[model samples]
Structure formats: C-alpha cells, structure tokens
Target: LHYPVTRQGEQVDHYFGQAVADPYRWLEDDRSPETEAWVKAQNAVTQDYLAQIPYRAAIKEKLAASWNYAKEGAPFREGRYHYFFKNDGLQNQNVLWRQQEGKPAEVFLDPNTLSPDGTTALDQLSFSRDGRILAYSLSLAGSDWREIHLMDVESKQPLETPLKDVKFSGISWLGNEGFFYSSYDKPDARTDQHKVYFHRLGTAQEDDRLVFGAIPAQHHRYVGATVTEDDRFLLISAANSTSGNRLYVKDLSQENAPLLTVQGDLDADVSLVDNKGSTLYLLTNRDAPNRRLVTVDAANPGPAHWRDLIPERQQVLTVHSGSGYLFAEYMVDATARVEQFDYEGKRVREVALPGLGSVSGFNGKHDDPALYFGFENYAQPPTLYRFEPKSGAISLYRASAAPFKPEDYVSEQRFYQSKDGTRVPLIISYRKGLKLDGSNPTILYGYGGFDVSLTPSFSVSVANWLDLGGVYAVANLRGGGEYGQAWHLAGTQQNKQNVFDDFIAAAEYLKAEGYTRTDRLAIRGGSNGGLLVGAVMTQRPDLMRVALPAVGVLDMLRYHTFTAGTGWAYDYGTSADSEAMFDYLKGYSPLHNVRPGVSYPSTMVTTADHDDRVVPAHSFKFAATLQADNAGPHPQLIRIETPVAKLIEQSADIYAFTLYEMGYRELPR
Candidate 1:
C-alpha cells in the first residue's frame, strides 16, 4: 500500500514548562495552498486504494437498495395543515410536505433544490404563534453556520428577511408579528458570545432588537430563547458548555418587565417546561442527579423557591409537552419507558410503547387532541404512532417502509463489564442464526462523551453491513445520558480515559464471546466519539484490525482554539487548564500519542471539507501522523468529503476497505 508524503512542520509548544513536538501542526490551516494540495494528494491516494476493491460497487448497490425506502417523520398539525418530512427512496434530503383536511399531500420545502449535490441541509423549522408564518433554518456544505429564512406558511412563499451567519441558535415565535432568535458575532475573537434578538416579520436583520445576552458574564457561550406555550413568557437558557445552564424568564404579558433569573448560576441543568400565568414548571437535575420537574412562581422564580413537582426517578427523565399533558419519557437502561402526567404534578398513566427502543417527539400544543411519536431500534426503521390524550389509546399511524422484516434480524441488548467494573450496555444486531465463530467482521461503534447516548437506531450503512454478513455492535459506554448526569460525570475531563477503557473492553467482550476476533474487529465513532476512536486506536493498536475515526477532535492541545471549541471545556478540560491536565491530555491525544514505528491498524480517517462542527483538521493531522509513523502494511488513509450522496458512497468505501483488509474479495450476502 502506498501513502502520500506529509510535509511536517517544526512546531513546538510548551504546555506547562514542558516542550511537546507538533511536527504536523501546519496541517491545521484549512486555507493554506500547501494544506490544500496535501489534502488533494491524500484523497487521491485513498481513492486509488479504494478503487481497487473488488466488491466495493456491490456493497454500494446493496446499501443504496436498502436505503431506498420511503422514510417519513411524525406528522403534526400546524394551522390547518398537518406537516411532516418525507424522503422518497434515495432523495438527497428529506422533503417537507403538508396536507389539509381530506386533501393530497403537497411539498412544503424541498432541500434538494437548495443544492445540486444536496450539500445544504435543513437544520430545523419553527412556526409563529398563530402558525401562519414559518421560520426555517439551513446549513450549507455541512458546516455548523446556519442561515434562517422566513415564509408564509399558508402560501409557501418566501419572505425576504433572511438571517445569516447564525450558529447554535433556536427560533421561538413571540407572536405572529415576529420571533426571537440567537446568534453571535466575532468568529475569531476567541470569546464566548451570542445575542438573542427579536426579528420582526418583514423587518431587516440589522434592526432586530437585542432581547437577551451581551452581558460581561457567562451568558455569552450558548444563549437560546424560547417563547412559552400560551405565548405569555419568553424563557432564556444560557450556558457556557454542553451541561448546566442559567435559566431566566421575562413576562411578555407586561411591557418592560425585568428578566428574572430562575437559576442564576450554571451549576446544574434547568429549563422551563411550561407556565400557567405567573406559575412556572421547570425541569432540572439540581440536587437530584437524574432530573426532576419543579414549579416556581414567576415573581420569585428561583431554585430555592422551586417545589418539586415530579421527583427524580432512578432512570433518566425527559419531558415533552403535548395534548394538555406532559409525556415523561425515561431512559431505562438506554430504552424507553414513557409515562403521562398532568400539569397538577400527578402521574396519569404509564404510556405503553410498541417495543424496547428509542422514542422521540411527543411535542404539541396543550389543547391539541392527539400527539405523535416515532419508535425504532437497530434492526427497524422508525414507525410513527399517534396517541389520543382523552382515551389514552395508542395506534400506529404509519408503518415504516423498511424492505426487511423485524423477524429476519435479532437486535439483542446484552451487558458487558468495563474497566473498574462499570456495567455497560452493548447491543449486537445481526441476521438471525448468523453463526459467530470468531471470524465475523465486527464493527464496535461507540460515542462515550458529552453525555450523548449511543442508543439503538437504524442506518443504511449498518443495514449494508448486516447484508454483507457483518456484525453491527453499539457500546453504550460512560459519559452518556443513558444512566444519568452521574454516568456522564464519570466519563468527562479527568476521567476521560474511562471512555477509551469502556470501548476497549467492549471489543474484548465481542472477541471473548466469539462474536469476532482481533483481526476481524474495527472501531468507529465521530466528533467526540472520533476522539474516542483515535484514543483507543493509539493506546491499543493491536486490539483491533481497523480504525475509522470520522470528523474527530484529534488535537487535544489546540481543540479549544477552534470555533466554539472552548465551550466544550466542561466535557474536555483544556490543555491550558493545568500542568496535570496538559500531561493527562498529551498522554492520550491521538496526534501527540502516535509513536514512531508503531504498526497501527488499517485506518481510514474521515472528515468533510465543510464540516465546521469538529473541523477536518483533526482527521488531517491524525491521518498524516498515522501515515508517517505507522510501520504496518495496512493502508493509512483519509477520506475527505466533497454530504449525503457521499454518505452512502463513503459508507461503501469504509465497508470495502474494512473487508478487503480482512482478506475478503467477496461478501456473504
């Protein structure tokens, strides 16, 4: 296997009186001509290598066929029309569609028209209080920067007022007149800042009033605003990182009302659930690690005055407002356990779900007659269901368009013990009676950081793997919301090594259980999980045969220097924090930890040129380091995306690479 020449730089940085070599540091500059050519050369090498794979096209065909299913989101009523998103077969993006009473469905907004390659993606949509106006947001080329656009919901005509350069924002309608949205300036200021603004309909973005934020304190990092249901109060959620936020509310019923703080400090997670006049219902993990519902008066909206409405349960709880009741969904061992509750703090009934999988979307107006939710697991597509609030009747609204039957595959939930004896849930999905003789091609996927759970869900790539007789396993490691805040705390900052250990133990579990052997194993994760895969790959290169770390944060020392990367200090203590922290990070950082002459695994690091979230620099640096130092015959490649069309394409390339390296010219399907 041939690799490209990575022009290394003589860069060194002293973290805490100790000098560390950053030989490949020049690759971080995305705009440099040398970096551009380096990226092009690397892509050519990777593509030329993948181009020789015999079954690459066959794998892609199977993936495209499996992916060509009519997927639709749960339908909800907005004004007189019920709206939902539908993707017919192989559309680049989901098309927003709507229907009136006894009328045919009409396309509301099609993102495929936004770009020829479907690189532009629809982030989200928000409707005005009366549901006559629609505010939609879009991100271009898969970047985190979003642009918001407005339109008439009834006519589907565009409004000229388009907000640009928005990132990490929310659009909450104050009324039919305008909406409250959040965005920040100073992209290179290295400062946390965002200003919540009131963008009146048909008004210019320049004239939008600064409704919240712009203070000297910590309200700047991640500021979001939402108008409460019944349209009486505007609630603000301010945070510097992923976890814990400062909650505030303003009485919009009265003009010039002071913004009152509900939780003045960012010690714990808290948010407004609903408000009845001056009374406020809030959700918080303060005092209780597993989140609970509490009530407070707007006049004295403080944590001290908040009385517990629904006390914290053993499982992680998340509430959704719909049909005049709160849908309390619990993550019981990474599975759904939904219950219904009234505004009066009384549990109504335990809402029975269709199966043991993830459930999402139980949101709607308080007076709506029904609510809808979608359910799915590893082996099944999401099936939408509608529920009647009065009768407590649950009925399937639409069965998924998945081509296969649920009976053909077995999605089993099994537990594995991690390092330090932490019981971790691992879901292994494969075709029924698929004999596991330790020769199976197994990909252990994990994202064990930032409180993000690795729950069972359907993906076309996983389906393709199953079709190719590959074992798809997901490890729910620590630093996830599966258990609670405590579980998350156990995997962040100082204890970040626990995530790597949990994943390594997961691979070992698979091999020990005869699911797969070392030569047949691969590990995959993206973003924070990308960091997960890179850390594990360096520490235990002999543990697995292949590594696919996509859109990873490989450079721990400089990660905080990137856009909004500083806010992640909660999950990842920066290298600038202290000598001990710098030492700890340098000990595990994928780039810094890459040892010379190490025969690393068959690695295909992945990222997108337009991926502003994690940034492609992470993959570039890691790939360069791996190629330069690796003594293994296995190819060290980087696949740079040029989004969805490439998703299945990249999926095919990844599978082919993994299989080809494992001594396979053909698949079993």
Candidate 2:
C-alpha cells in the first residue's frame, strides 16, 4: 500500500518562539508543477485501490438508479410569471421554470445547458419588481467565486452588462433601471474588504458605483443588500464573519440618502423581513437567542427604537413573508414547527405540516395568494406543498417520483450526552426490520461549527446507503445553530474540542445501542464537519473502522491563509491570535496531530479541485500525512475534484471504499 512520494519542503513558521514544520506546504501552491505531479500520482494510487473492489461499480450503478427521481421546487410569483425549479431525474442541474396564469410551465433558464461538464451551478436569482428583468449568479465547480448575468425575462435573452469577480453577493434591484450587488476586490486577494455596488442596465461593469463597505476600519468580510418589496427602502447587512452582522437602512425614495444605522454592532444577527410604509419589520436574535420579529420606524431604525412584534419563544425561529403575512418556521429539536402571524404580532394559525420532519421556502411576494414550502426527512423524499393564506388550507403541490417507499424505512431522532454531559441530538435512519446485533454497517455524519444547523433533510446518498441495509445517522453537535447561538458558541475556538467530543460520543452511542460497533462503523463529514471527522479520527483512531473527511479544513494553523478562510476565525481563531490559541489548535489540528507509527482508520480524504473556499490543499496535506504516518494495513486514500458528475463518482467511491474496508465481500443483493 505504498502511496505517492510528496515533496517534503523545509517550511517552518515560528509562533510564540515555537517552530512548527509544514512539510506538505508546497501542496498549497495550486500552480506548482510539483503539486500537480503529486496530485496525479495520489489520484492514480486511489483509483488503483478502488479498482480492486468488486462491488464498486455495482454500488455506483445502484446509486445512480436510487438517485433517479423527478423533483420540483415550490412555485413563487415574480411579476407576471410564477417561478420554480425542477429536475426530471438524472439531470446535472435543475431547470428554472416560469408559468403564466393557467399556462403550461416553460423553461426560463436551464442550468444543465450552461456548461457541458456540469461544473457550472446556479447560485442565486434576483428579479426586478415587474419581473421583466432577472439577475442571477453562477459559480463554477463549487467555488464561492460567482459571476452575475442579466436575463430579460420576457425575451429570455441575455444583457451585455455581465458582472465579474463577485462572491458572497446578493442582487438587489433599484427599480428596473439598476440593481445592487456586493463583491470583494478579489477573493484571492487575501483581504477582508467587501463592497456593495450599484449596476445600471446597459452600463459597463466597471462603471457601477460603490454603495457601501467603503469605510476602511469596517473590514467586514461579508456584505449583503436587500431592497424592500415596495422598493422604498434598501436594507444592508455587514459582518466581519459568518455569525453576526450590523444592519443599515437607506431610503431609496431619496437620491443620495444617507444610510441609517439600525444595528451598530456585529453582536447579533438581524434581517429585514418586510415593511409597511415607514414601519419596518425585522427578524433578529438581538435580545433573543431563539430569534423574534420586531418592528421599527424607517426614520429611526435603530435597535432601541425596535419593539418586538412577535416575541421570542423557546424554539428557534425563521420567518418568511408572503401574502402580507409572516410565516414563522421554528425548529423544535431539529424538527419543523411552523406558525403564521401578522404584522401586528397576532397569531393566525399553526401551519398544519404533513409531519414533524423539516420545511423550507415559505417565502415570496406580499401579494401572492398562496405560500409554498418543501418538506422531507432522512428517508422521506422531498415534497412541495401549497398553503392558501386566506383560507388556511393546504394541498400537495408536487411529490418526488423516487423509487423508494417511505414505509419500508424508519427515521427516529434520539438524544445523547457529549464528553461534558452536554445533550446532543442524533437522527438515525434505516430499514424498518433491521437486526440490532451491532454487525449492521453504519455511517455517522456530523458538522459542528459555524452556527449551521443540522436539520432533517433528504439526501440521495443516505437513501442509497439505507437501500443497501446500512444505518445512516446524523449527529447535531454543539457548534450548530439547531439549539441556538449559545449552543454554537460551545464549539468555537478553544471550545472546539466540544465538537470533536460530541461527535465521538455519538459514534459510541451507536455502538453502545447495538446500531453498529467500531468494526462496522464509518464516520463522515464535509467542510467544517470534515474537520470534525478528521479531528475525531485522529484523536481516537480506534473509535471507528472507516473515515471519510471531504473538503475539510485539516490544517488549523494556516486555514486563514486561503481565500475568505480568514472569516472562519469566529469559530477557529488563527494561530496568530495568541500563543494559547496557537497551542490549543496545535494540540488537535488533524494534520499536525497525526503521530508516526499510529494505526489510523481506513481513510479516504475526499476533496474537489475547484473548491476555493475550503481548498483541497487541506485534504492533500492530511492524506499525505496519514499515508506516511499510518502503521496499519488499512488503506489511506484521497479522492479529488468530486463535483457534479465527479461528485456522484466520488460518493460512489466513498460508499464503496467505506463498505469494502468495513469487510464487505460483495454487493448485498
């Protein structure tokens, strides 16, 4: 099982008088031929190992069949046309559809036609009030870097003024004449500077005027803009990181109006939901960890002027506006609980959801007659539903045509304690009649950082696993937004150990409860969760049999060096933050902690060539280290460029590698 020879460069950076060697550091240079050669050699080794698995092709074939399903998104009105997204099974990208009153749906834009290799993805869409014009962004191969394109809705033709070098942006319309979007000078420029600019129709992209983020001291890593539905006010949000933002409002009715500071600190999250004349509605967690709907005057839209319209409750709230009403979708223990309310904070009625899974997209224009949302769980395929706002009635808008019966499987959420006795939630899904002999193959998934919640959602890979009689469990660890802001803070910075501990305890819970034991268990996570898998697999290698960390942040010390990776400092402080923070990070940084002569888990570190956000260099260094340091006979591999078509192959390879290394002899069927 000899791996490729990675060049060990003499790279050392001193922090707090302690020298740390970064041998695989050359991999971080994406343009180096040395790095390219190493990547090719590593991929060759990985494909060679995967070729030996007899059922690898069988798994991919089944996964493709399992993934084949017709799906459609909830429809929303934009001017004269009703818009929705749809995929007729096996399509690389969802086609955007628009419909008139009682007319057949027509394709407004088909992302599948945008690129030949399916690497281009539709990132976001913003429509003018009249819906005559639309501004949308597309990202290539999972890179956060986006390009904005204007399409005349009626003609289905493109405009000449295409935006370039945009990231972390939202297209907000300033009437049909111009629109607003945010972007940095360069995402690869290693700066936290982000600016909001106004792009006028028929104008050169360079002529767009900067609207916000000009102040040098702000250094906000992210900037956002949303024009009020009436186009009377423009709301802007600025933040240095992902967690919180300072909000501002400007009267679009006036030319050259000064922006009013609604929130002056980056301490809490705030967003403008809608507005009624001078009265503004905001959804925020300002004084409420669970979030609440508040109202203020446009004249003085400061925090003190804000009064709670809908008081915060125990459950976390996410509000959507439609038909002149607010739909508050709450998360009660990582499940869906939605309620309707008005501008006066008067409770309308509890939304009668299909069941207690999860619901998303109850948002649209204020004049629409109905609201639409999608619902699904681990085993349940996603189905779109329509809600009549006036009559409080519901109807199934559309249901998935996947070839899987929900009755054959069961999804249940259970609670478990972490290393510090902090209670965490884990949802386990499997076939209905499974034996509890602990020999059943299992995959445990987690992502415990960035205040992102792990809600119950449908995934094709999990479905494939369950179809093959495997248990798929998702652990909602400490650093997620499931419980609230307080829960997220528990897994950040020096407290990052809690996230690892939480995931480790979850694996133990599965084994202890006879779902699976160490020999049959595989732990997997992506991005931040990839860091979770890497840290956990390194800290306690004997806990699981297989490890799959995809597109991970393995090297904690230099994570801030790439793209906007610096913004993640809110969760993982940079090594230069302080000597103590440096020491704490070095203590468990997966790439640094891989000790020589240790028997690491049978591992496959997955990443993409186009992943600029969490760069592939992370997986590169970590895999090289594991391959060099591992003393076990278990295989250590890295799969790269796992996106779209490649993404499916990557998932197939991962599942195949996971099951094969777990001692599977052939296809279960």
Candidate 3:
C-alpha cells in the first residue's frame, strides 16, 4: 500500500547543501527572522562537506590524466600521431600534444591562460581530419550553450563564428575548410529536432544553412552525428518523442538533397570509421528494441544502401574500423569477445579478452603499423596490448599506473524480472567463486534514467571491494537509454515507480540467485539516478540495507525550479496543471514521502557545492529529512559540498572511495 502527501506551503531557502543542514527539523518560519539564524547554524555542520574534500588539486590532475586515458582520441597519420584531450578544469586541449616519437605535446590553446575571468570547462570538442584546425564548445560551469571556437594548429590563433540560438551537440569536419554539427532545443517548437548545419570557416554565422532537420521530440534532443567519407553526405539520430530512434542521411551534392536513407519504427545511427568520415557501420533495433549490432556495407551511403553485417543479440555490441580490418566487441553475460572482420563482412581475426569490464579500442589509427587494444575488467586495472593479426598474439602495451591485475577478480551477469515481468540486466562482480552464503556485504549501483546506458569499463580502485569481501552489482534498469528510448520513458515521471521497482527487483533477483539478501544490499545513484536512491529508500526500506545518493536530485516536485529539469517536461509532466501527475509525484517526492515512524535504510545524501546543474539543496533537504525522520537503527550521514567538479572524477573518488571505506566496495572478483 502507498500513501500521498503534499508540501504546498513549505518555505524555500536559497542556500542548500551542507551549508544549511537541519537534520532534526524541516519547517521554515517564513514569518520569523530567526529562520535566518537557523539556516546559518545549519551551514556550520552542513558546510563541512565542502571544506572536507581531500587532495583537491592533486585529485583534479589525476582525474584529468585518467580521463584522457579513457575517453581521449588517438590518431596517427603521415608518421605523426595526435591524441586529443582536456586538461585542468573544463577547457579542452589545455595540455600540449605529445608525439609517441619522444616529443612533448605542443601547447595548442589554454583557455585558462587567455581569460582574465578564468575559462570554464570545454563540453564539446572535435578536430579536423588533417588536425590543422580544431573546433570546440565551452560552457561556464556546465551552464548555457557554448560558443563554437576554432583554432589554428600552427599559430594557435582563435576564431569565433559565435552561433546564437544554437547549442552544439557534436561536430565533424566535412573537409579541411567546412564542418557539420547538430544542436539542441532551438527557437523552434520541436525541441527534439536536430537541425544539422554546414558551417564554412569564411561564412558568417547567419549564412549557416540547415543541411538536415531531425524529428521533433519533447523528451530527448538529437545527440551525435557523422559525415560520410566522400564528403557529400551525413547521418544523424533523434529519440525524444518516439518509442525508438530514427536514422537519416542527407546528401550535400544531390539535387533532391536531405534524402531520407532509412525511415523506420526502429532506432538507428550511422556508425562511422575511426576517422568519423566513412560510414562503415549502422546500429539499429529493427529486430529487437532491447539489443542491436553493427550493420555494414561499403556502399551504404544512406539507409537505402545499408545491409546486414552483424546480427543482433542479447549481448552489447560495438564495431570500429582499423588498419586493414574492422574490430568488434561483443559483450554478453558480463564477458566480451574481440573479433575482426573485413569490408566484405568476412571474419579476419578473433580473440577473447575475458574478465575485462570496460575496454578501450585500439589506440593507434586505422593506418597505424600495429594494432593496439586496451582492456580492463572490474577486477583488473586498465592494460593496453598490441595485437598481431598474422601471429594471433597480443603483447602488453602499457598497464595503468595503479596496482591491480586480472588474476584476482571475477565478474558475472545476473538478470532479474521487474514487477511488470521485464528481465533487467545486472553486471555482478566479486572475488571469484567466493561463498554466497548471504553473509558477505554488497554495494549495488544503478542509474535507471536519461536513456544513458552503462557499459563495461575498467576501474582502478575497485579492488577495494573485493578485498573487503563485498559484492558490487551494476544494475542496468529501466528509464535508461540502455534498452533504447522506450525503456527510458517507461521508467520516468508517472511511470517513475517502475525504476524503483526495477532496482528492488534487481536486489530481489540477486537474493533469489544466491548473491546476497536484502540485508547486504547497498544502493547508489547520481543525478536523476540520485532521485532513484531517495525514492527507493522511502518505498522499500526493508529491501535495502544502505543508500548513497550522490549529487542527487530529490525534489522531484520542484526539480524544475532548479537546473535544466524545467526542460524535462516530457519525462516528468508539469506539476501545476495535472492533478494526476501531482498525485503521482507526491507519492515519490522524497520530502513528502517520508513518514513519521517508518524505518529507513542507512543513507548518505551527497551533493557538490559548485554543482550548478543539480542544485545541492535537493540533496541537502533530503539529508535533513532522512536524518530527522529516519526510524531505522542504522545511522544516516550527509556529504554536502559546493559543486566542485563535473563528471569523471571529483565525486567518483570522494563518494565511491568513502563508501568503499564504510562497508561498501566496487563490484568484486
């Protein structure tokens, strides 16, 4: 049985997070001046989360290096190899480029060096094929659309076309002189529509032409795009409104122009060669919405030209074109296989790099003299290897500076059926073959919304989990892009209950599968995921042993009141007009759902002070409510800090590290 409540007249405070924690009470006297005094006092204990961050600058440096190792681009051409990366804060390429031939990377452009006001982080970035010209987008602490700036490689001179009413989604060079990119919710009514543009360096921003416009959607905006090898065509995908995605290709040279290549009820995207210039693959779900694989054809310039290359399966699949071959990673059952295929769709080489969770593709370019692949699993640190197709042997390239190895860890995939009978995927890892006698402690991780799919990637410090004999499970739940847009929408807003249901189902699934029982499970999520953490705490306290909501968004009712959540109207219906929506929201809003006497799991509400995206107040009030109202025997703690950093590090270490130290660990073995 569930109950509904309201906080129609609750007082609002500007300062949130640890700076104004009041765990024992949560009422604001809008009429009393003493309210100000109380808020100040709360900040004394609450603000501690901000000042408590350890190894501030050192952590940032380590995070940037690790990020470069994980997400940066590595390309080689004409005896020269270039790797693109961001440095310090958000500024792109703040570091100099390094050539493997024993030369320090030349300093390209350090935004931090030029701005009197200090530069913000670079959000979107891409380089031309020739690497002579670089283009990037910047935001002030993750707020507002950024200006697209171009820089000359030799002189380091900057040029600004300065686009207004446009947020750059991604960019790809059509050639040395022209580039193409996509944008978000525009001045137009179709927010989900991705209008592609052809921006020439010499052309004025006003002269930019709309090469292609995507289908409109209120929920998801168009994300990524790619240009064809011939430079006459481009491809894009959009998923906000429909149950799935739509893929389209536009020809620049054709008189008919903007031709639809593939029109379908299924989701699709043009997967390109490593150069981002040729369409070597297309990912679609015409056969299955929950799974997809690479479909390739050398002549596939449009959807009409596409043909089957790799069939769909329950496993996660990825393909990349390499020197003289195409590399593929097929992930199923928490294990992965790396294979090579020819342009004719013939298998050239195949090998298995087992126990690797998240692996990186070959670091060198398609034309590189050698093939180098990187692999890492839950138990091992990232290790790079050079593979010889002829010899069928892989030689170590480099291992992460962190100390860890594959021999000690084991990971397995477990599935749970949701309340609605959907089988949810769970990637479970722990010390191999350990006793599953329900005595081991465990930390379960999940982020079930925003259509964001979590893939296998290696972690350095996750060994701590195994060392502590705690199991870690990464639950791929609904409301996430993992299974496609339909899965995402199914677990959001009024249907939001499905996300909690799926998470609880994951816990119950593990219990039924002999991993651990409810008493051993700890739940963790961030952002919209953080909302799940809080909601689960209120909905099924008995099923979860602990909770961690990092940089969470708990005030679902007024989440629109802060951050970009107002734009999320499609995911969450407006709270003012729809009484049904209100009832639904009131049922899960953490603040309103907290009962006076129900027992709750031990929880830690974490938020960064500098985080402008999701306000700290959401976590702040949540911690206050849980600390004051929790009836469970376990203690409740809150880690509140000014938003200090963006994705990748800051919180991962602070939150994950602390949690690991306090009876939780990364997925083990």
Candidate 4:
C-alpha cells in the first residue's frame, strides 16, 4: 500500500522548488496532458463550489454592511464614523457610513465613497473630537507593521507619515502633543523573558516610559495595561508560573509606589471607564473556574477595595463599567442576558438577547452606560440590537440577514466524556431529526489554546453542511479558557496529550451515541488547534475518517527558529533546557513521529501560500512526507491558497468549511 509521491528529504524539496519556481511547469511540462486536464477540472470544481447560493449571497450581504466604525488620525481629536464594504470577486469596494446622531438607532453608516483599496487593509482608526481629522493603520501587502496615517476629515488629504513603517497600534491623544500609541515587537524580537514597552505622546526621549515593562513577557498576556479615568494608574496582568497573576496599579506620573492586589488565585481583567474617574472595574474568575464579571473599586494607588457587582457562574461572560452603572453580558446555559447593575450590584435593568443562540458582540453607549449595542447570532447571520438601561427597553439596531432564518433549524448542547472522564461540551446543530444511524455525516471542530474560550458561534456555512446531511460539532476541549485558568493549564506542556486524547474521545463518544460512525467523522482545527489535529492523526487516526490540519506546527524541534516560534515556548516548552519537555513533545510532534508505513486517513494539510505566521513550508514538507510514507493509494495531500485576506478572505473561506467529509449544514430542528 505504500506509495512514493515524492522521494524522501532532499528530492521532495527539489520537486517543490521546481513546481513553485516554474509556474508554467504545473500545466505543460511536469505531468501528462490527461493529468493536467484533471487539475484544470479540479479548479473548475472549486469555482463551482464558490458559486453556491449561500456562499455568494452571504459574502455580498456581509461586505455590504461591514463598514461601521470610527476612523480619524488628527493630532488631538476623537473622530467617529461608520465605514462599510463588500467583495464582488473582482475588487474590494468601500463605502463610507452615513448615520444621524439622534436617529432611532435604526440608521447606520451609509456608503459615501471608496475609502481605500483592498490591499491597504484598514486597521485601527481614531477620530478628532471636532471630526476634522481621521487617523488609521493600514498595510500595503498586509504585513506586520501597519503605518499610522492621518487624513483631513473634510478634504481627505493624506498626512505625511502615511507611507512610513511606523508600526503603531492603540492610538490615543493627550492634547495632540503627537498622539500616544502602544507598539509590538517585530516577529524576531518577541521572547518569553522580554517586555513590550509603550511610548507616550510625542516623546522620542529615552525616558518617555509611560508604562514600564509592567508584565514580563508582555506579549503572552491576554489584556494589557489600562489607564484609569484620571490617568493615575495602569492595570496589567500576566500568567504566573504558579497559575494566575497579581493585578497591579502603578502611578501615572513619573514616580510612585505601585499598589498590588491581594495575591490570591484570581485571574483579573481590568478596564477603566473613560468618563468616570473614581471607578475601576475588574472581571475575574476568582471563584468559579469558567465564569467572570463586574467587580469595582473606588480608588487606585491603594488597596483594591472590590465590590462584586457581577457574580461568577458556570458559563463565562463579560461586564463593561460606565458612568454610574455596570453593563453585564452574562452567558446563560442557553442564549445571553444583557443587564445593567447599579453601584450596589443590583440588576436595575435586563434585556434578553432575542435569538436563542449567542450574542456575538456587545458595546456600551458612549453617552450613557445604560444605552448599549448588542449583536446576537443564530443559525442565520447575526442581528444587531440596542438596549436602553434606564427604561429597560430593547430595540433592533439592524437585522443581519432576513434571507437567513435560524428558527427553521434546531441547535442544542451535547455533552460527552473525554478519556480522562472530564465532561467535554459540544455545540451540535443540524437539520431536525438528523438520523442517529452510523451512516450520517458529522464534523467535529476544536481549538484549545491561550485560555481563549471558544465562543458559541452561528456560521452561515453551517447551513451548507446541513444541506449535505452532516452534523457539525464544536468540542470545548481543554487548554482553552472555557473552564478557566486551570482548564487551560491542564492541556499545556506535558499535559498537551490530553487535548488530543480528549478530541479523539469526543469523536468516539459521538459515534457511541449513534450521531455518526468512524467513516462519517471528520476532525478539524487551525493554528494551535492545528497542532491538536496533527497529534490526533498520529495518535488515533483510526478514530476519524477525515483530517484537516491548517497552518499547524508539526516539527516541534525547529519551531523556535521559524517565523515567530520563540514566543510559543510558554505554551509548548522549548527543547533548549528541559529533557522531560523534549521527551513529552517528541511523543506527539507530527513531523518527528509520523509512522513510516501505516496508512493515515485521507488528510489535507491547508496553509496560505503567503502565510508568515506558521510558514507554509511546514505543511508543504509534512504533506510530502505523508504522501510518501502513508500506506494507501489515496495519498495524503495539501491545499495551499494565497488569500486576499487572512481568516476571511475576499470571500469567507466557504470551501474550507464545506470541502471536508462532514461538510456544512444548518441546525436540524
């Protein structure tokens, strides 16, 4: 059964080099004419897949209403405007949003004119208070450092620094003495023992240190320093070798003794209300591992006198603090609860996000904390809603799509036990009465990394999977922040095997429950989740019928020397020191440990042709190895694309979602 797609090692490299460097060879020289025709026809199939109704319709709908945010780069003003755009395959067309201030919230940014080209991706934008200047971050080739540029609000004249490699993020103003910003290191400089420093307004001085290296290895942190309303303190947090970290407050001025919180197991995220000077809010999972919410203090540079305005829960959620009240978005077992809490932690107002699915986004009104914006998702496209805290009134801001109706389908939560007996949560949705027989198709997806909890999402392409009679499952596996810091730690380093084992057990459980059989089961993940996919394929390839590992780290040994591998040492221990870490890593690293002649399931290693993140070569080489070593006539292969954008390309990555065996489908009711 062993097939040699390409000879080992150096020969594989030579073949790829020829294929890449000689563009015409892919068509005329390298293969038989019949084989060339098959390749052309395969491209045609993808083109046909691209023309599907939902794919075409959704892209048009999303791009049409996408521009809805502020964009200004003036020296001293905060500007506000909503922008919009849509992709029509040929080019990215931009339209400026036109909205009235006091309208019934029914209006949004309307198309004004083309802002910029698709290549010049719009990043963060800030507006001048008088709406005279607009500052934005844009990259020509979608590279690392986005230049900070300014535009005249009325004239739209490009400012001088528009073409520089300024590499700035988080632009703010302090009387325009040149705007302040936070900067991240070039891909090469980031490290575990290093710090990300901040620069103050217009200060090129060596001592312009506004916020010192508050947290070591700052890039690893989830949330960075927040300035209090009075600009008197900076709140910073990072993971401690001992689990969680201590939130500290440093003086805003040149000199002071920073205040440290009571060092408990609490993991806190702090945000300072812009208008309120006395209050500081913190969201922490100090009690329940999977939950968080509003806690406040009256003063900074002093003891953190906390008042738990929002309590902990099993389902994680968020809290936003403003003027006199707190806006909380609590995650319930089903759906979301948006409420307003008085200073005493009493729920003065509550609004139920309509769709019985999930609220994708939430924002507090700039003028009133009680007036908030919310986005709820269902099997259909997301819908926007507004809540008035004072009157407890809920109003529709905008409906994402009328053509997509979630009520036509059924979605439910399914729980299955991992190998370790830990109950894993899965969000399963499909067309109703999905056959419980082993013949039905199913796709299980997962991402367990950085304590970033997987949010329940309603994807339009899921409807496509349902159309194929497939059941889609999202496994809330370990190493994710879903269950909290402890949960994430359980799946990192030596415990990383748990993530793969857990994912395999999840697929087994799905089959055991009669949702799908091994032949119908497909497993997928990306980035760190990509590592999970690779590990599972090697560890238990028999458990899954299809495997897709996109932009994953397969060769653990050489990762540190590649693009940005040094920063990941915290998640996956480096082979530099610990022998135990090396031993643990060797057991699972896909590239180093792949079996020589055992057939793996049909596998596709996906990566962007232009991806600098994980580097495309890793996937290219791994797929070549799999093709050579796999004991099957159906060779494991690779699909590489150069997208106009990263995650959501010119069109949403519809084919990536639909090509797998499980395919995409709507929730069955």
Q: Number of clashes in every candidate structure?
A: 0, 0, 31, 32
Each candidate structure's TM-score, on Cα atoms with residue i matched to residue i, is 0.77, 0.77, 0.64, 0.65
Per-model C-alpha lDDT, please? 0.86, 0.87, 0.62, 0.57
lDDT agreement of model 3 with the native: 0.62
Which residue runs does candidate 2 get wrong by more than 4 Å?
Answer: 4-35, 66-69, 76-85, 89-272, 275-279, 284-290, 297-304, 314-316, 364-369, 390-393, 556-569, 574-579, 608-617
Give the winner by lDDT: 2
Q: Output the better candidate (1/4) by TM-score.
A: 1
Instruction: State the lDDT of candidate 3 residue by residue for 186-244, as single tens digits.
Output: 42253645677768887777777666563443224554567765466666655544456
Task: Supply candidate 4's per-residue lDDT for 80.
Answer: 49
Per-residue lDDT for 1-669 in model 2, tens only? 869887788999898999999988888875578877788888899999999999899889877767667888888778777788888876878899989988898888998888888788898888877888889999998689899999888888887657898899988887788888888873224466888888889888878888888787556889988898889999989998778899999998888898999999988999988999899999998989788899999899889989988889988778898888889888888899888888788989998988768888778777787888889999888888889998889998887787788788789889999888888999999989998889889999999989998888888888889988899999999999887778889999999999999999999999999999999999999999889999999999999999999889999999998877888899999899999999999999999999999999899988876567888889989998998899989988987762445657877898889889988898653
- Candidate no. 3 TM-score: 0.64
Question: What overall lDDT, based on C-alpha atoms, would model 2 receive against the true structure?
Answer: 0.87
Question: How do these models rank on TM-score, best leading?
Answer: 2, 1, 4, 3
Stretches > 4 Å off in candidate 4: 1-5, 9-96, 99-269, 274-301, 304-308, 311-317, 321-324, 330-339, 349-351, 355-362, 366-372, 376-378, 388-396, 574-579, 609-611, 642-669
Is candidate 2 or 4 superior in TM-score? Answer: 2
Q: What TM-score would candidate 1 get against the native? A: 0.77
